[PDB]
Amino acid sequence: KVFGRCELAAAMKRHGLDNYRGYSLGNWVCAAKFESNFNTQATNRNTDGSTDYGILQINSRWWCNDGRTPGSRNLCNIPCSALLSSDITASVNCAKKIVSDGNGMNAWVAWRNRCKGTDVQAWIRGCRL
Ligand SMILES: [Cl-]
Ligand SMILES: [Cl-]
């Protein structure tokens, strides 16, 4: 599923991501656009043999199981296919665990390099939230 910008903002708000760990919803919309272009089915392979999955591009070396990242953790306790669903609940729940692990949203490179220090609220502007 390829989300609309205000559609995703609304679905993130429903799932408790607005102001979660002090991050306003713009930051979530922003890191979704530049990681996955709002496509829940985005996958990308990393150099080390791990894979990023879903609308936030969550990494198999630490958070999910794809059965092909030898010696990786499953700290969100989910198969990585579950992040590719049209229902973002699994992605949101894992993302709450990630952002709370100490390093904030800097875990997401594309948030660090393309959203942080920006007027992130522009990403929710015009939306009925
Ligand atoms: Cl915002
Ligand atoms: Cl980047």
Q: Which ligand is nearest to the CA of 108?
A: 2
Nearest CA to 42 among 70, 85, 84?
84
Long-range CB contacts for residues 19-26, cutoff 8 Å, separation at least 24: 20/96, 20/99, 21/96, 21/99, 21/100, 21/104, 23/99, 23/104, 23/105, 24/120, 24/121, 25/124, 25/129, 26/115, 26/120, 26/121, 26/122, 26/123, 26/124
- Cα 90 to ligand 2 centroid, rounded to whole Å: 24
Q: Residue 7 catalytic? A: no
- Cα 32 to ligand 2 centroid, rounded to whole Å: 12
- Cα 70 to ligand 2 centroid, rounded to whole Å: 26
Q: Residue 48 catalytic? A: no
The identity of residue 48, as a single letter, is D
Is there a binding annotation on residue 48?
Answer: no
Technique used? X-ray
Indicate which residue of 18, 52, 66, 87 is catalytic: 52
- Cα 65 to ligand 1 centroid, rounded to whole Å: 32
Domain 1-129 coded CATH 1.10.530.10: yes
Domains of the chain, by residue range, sit at 1-129
Q: Distance between CA 104 and CA 78 in Å, rounded?
A: 21
